[PDB]
Amino acid sequence: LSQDFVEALKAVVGSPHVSTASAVREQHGHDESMHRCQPPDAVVWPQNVDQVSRVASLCYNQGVPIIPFGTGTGVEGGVCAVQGGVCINLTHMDQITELNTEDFSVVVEPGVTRKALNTHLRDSGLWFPVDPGADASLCGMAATGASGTNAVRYGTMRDNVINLEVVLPDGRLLHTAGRGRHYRKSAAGYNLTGLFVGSEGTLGIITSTTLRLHPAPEATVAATCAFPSVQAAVDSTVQILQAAVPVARIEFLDDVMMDACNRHSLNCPVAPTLFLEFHGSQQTLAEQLQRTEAITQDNGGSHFSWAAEKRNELWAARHNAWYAALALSPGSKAYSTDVCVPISRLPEILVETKEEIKASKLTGAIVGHVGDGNFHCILLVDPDAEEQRRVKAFAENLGRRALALGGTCTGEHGIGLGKRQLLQEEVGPVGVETMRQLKNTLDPRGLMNPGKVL
């Protein structure tokens, strides 16, 4: 970056909001993944959408790559500046607006996290359910297509994003469903909102998200259930889903993960475990609990260990599983897998994954959203090239096994830098070309987060 170009950026956002300092660039050059690249050439903090547009236009027309940056909690290298350029940190736009409690909807800017929104909504009787473990930007969650523990009942970001405000790569402003619009369903034209959910910053910059809100449950019960084997826990999960029990949360931890979480938080029996949560009235809960206990008992599950204080720490421990695993070997980093398969194939692939972790000399823990047919294998790495190549090979083989079972290589984390070859295998040549044609019409010069997804 030329001094002329830096001065032009400063003319848009203000001198304090542009930095070319190495330490600041390095802090914005990575996420929570093990990937690393040269850092961006500058970091810029726009203060409003007009500034986002003008920064994008300046970069685009000068041939400078743009890297959108929310809270930097992604795990696939989405913010890594593989071709340099300008990192646009969006978190100074942090306002909640257009709260429509009667319509179950709200508009948030990129600096708003789920915790901030739900704190704003205290006493409204409403909440936002999609819950990554990290304190992530809600617009970043829209960009990655995030889900979480509550998605089995309340949906993913794709289910709960009603509208998006997007600055396109050349600076034009798009409201994907129309400015100010919010509604339960539409057949009007092509659905542009779904195209930008899960686009990971490669099609434009999300500067606001319109979110579906949900009623707070009448009553809540959480519990844990320990099992003799991974097979028994995952068989119970599949049978709970096939019985159509509307569980609010159903999270699997293997024995390694449960021990890690105990040590980093809980004193649950070290065994493959389900964390469960149920929502309803006193009267629906009793029914759901009886039917779910009947199924878990059939598969060797323990009596439910029941859990505001204790369920809050139960789910905080789950949400920090990433850090619990890293803490097993301080100094390590980690890669996470994220496959999602048809639920009837989930027992095969989890049990196979457990066996393969046992047979390898990698250290790995298993956790995740099995109600969705989804799970994470957390593989620790010495930041040891041969161990790194074994971890990459393990993750590729697990991805390809998921694809062989009719599934997908990522249920929620995205593609970033790590899964680009798996995506090509997953959708094939016509799928790849079609995605690339979409990328090219919105980003002709290829400057919108280059090197990611495709």
Ligand SMILES: Cc1cc2nc3c(=O)[nH]c(=O)nc-3n(C[C@H](O)[C@H](O)[C@H](O)COP(=O)(O)OP(=O)(O)OC[C@H]3O[C@@H](n4cnc5c(N)ncnc54)[C@H](O)[C@@H]3O)c2cc1C
């Ligand atoms: C402990 C922990 C637990 C997690 N649990 C989950 C989980 O349960 N489910 C899940 O889905 N993820 C989970 N994540 C991953 C991560 O939190 C999500 O992917 C989240 O959506 C990333 O948001 P972010 O703003 O931090 O992303 P960043 O890392 O800042 O960016 C991620 C990608 O999105 C792009 N991007 C970010 N903001 C925008 C924007 N406003 N407009 C356009 N593109 C943008 C970036 O360019 C990049 O490609 C977890 C992460 C951690 C560390």
Ligand SMILES: CC(C)CC(=O)C(=O)O
């Ligand atoms: C921490 C992530 C790598 C795994 C995840 O998404 C989760 O904890 O559910």
Ligand SMILES: [Mn+2]
């Ligand atoms: Mn997850």
